[PDB]
Amino acid sequence: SMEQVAMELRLTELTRLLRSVLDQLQDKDPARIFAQPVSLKEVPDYLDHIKHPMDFATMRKRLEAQGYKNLHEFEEDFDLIIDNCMKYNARDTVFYRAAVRLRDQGGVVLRQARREVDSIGLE
Ligand SMILES: CC(=O)N1CCN(c2ccc(C#N)cn2)CC1
Ligand code: NA
């Protein structure tokens, strides 16, 4: 149907916008602390602590499968990256501090993204 094609165009468009957001958020992690999943070879007990791991590479896979239906779903995953880190690592670590900085600097990008999604009407 034409409707299904229209839908897929918007989803494709949403994906295009979120790819830009994802690149902007990742730039706020210059140390690449959040670029890849936490290594279960290096941190063998990680899943005893964190039940829903997330990282930028995994977000990117889902993004390219057009697996984010709306901005809220994308934001949930971003929040998992930060929130997992701020629980696993103590306040006086480079890891916790990197998450705080990513949270604070990312809020700007995400505030804008929410306005653009609403405005251009991508869902
Ligand atoms: C982002 C995050 O929470 N991480 C947990 C702590 N972490 C570690 C810990 C121990 C070893 C070793 N060997 C390597 N990396 C980096 C990833
Ligand atoms: Na903690």
- Positive or negative CA dihedral for 96, 101, 102, 104? positive
Q: How many domains does the chain have?
A: 1
- CA 31 to ligand 2 centroid distance, Å: 21
Residues within 5 Å of ion ligand 2 by Cβ?
87
Ligand 1: lining residues by beta carbon, under 6 Å: 33, 38, 42-43, 85, 88-89, 95
Which residue bears the tokens 């890849």? 36
Experimental method: X-ray
Q: DSSP secondary structure string, 40-77?
A: TTTSTTHHHH-SS---HHHHHHHHHTT---SHHHHHHH
Residue owning the nearest CA to atom 12 of ligand 1: 42
* CA-based max dimension of the chain: 56
Domain that holds residue 5: 1-123
- Resolution at which this structure was determined, Å: 1.5
Provide the CATH number for the domain around residue 108: 1.20.920.10
- CA 36 to ligand 2 centroid distance, Å: 20
- Positive or negative CA dihedral for 118, 66, 30, 104? positive
